[PDB]
């Protein structure tokens, strides 16, 4: 019954692939709630005019 979200952000100079490097992820947010989620989407933004 705890949704945990861990996050990290790094500067990148290589073009495409995941860098061959190591950088741990810091804990960010905890939520003491309970839901049975099993499917997740991912949103997007666009320009409309």
């Amino acid at each position: 019954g705890y949704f945990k979200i861990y996050s990290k952000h790094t500067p990148i100079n290589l073009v495409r692939d995941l860098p061959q490097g190591f950088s741990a992820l810091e804990p960010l947010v905890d939520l003491p709630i309970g839901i049975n989620i099993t499917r997740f989407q991912t949103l997007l933004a666009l320009h409309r005019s």
Partner: protein
Amino acid sequence: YGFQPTYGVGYQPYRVVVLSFELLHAPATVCGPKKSTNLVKNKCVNFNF
């Protein structure tokens, strides 16, 4: 009702609030705090941090 300032005892308006506590298995969040007293250094004591 016809509430008036001249209404006698048992007839005047009375505001009532009822608090009901529910104990769902979801993690508890509404709790009363405990009085943190103070800290003391250089004395063999016991602590509840």
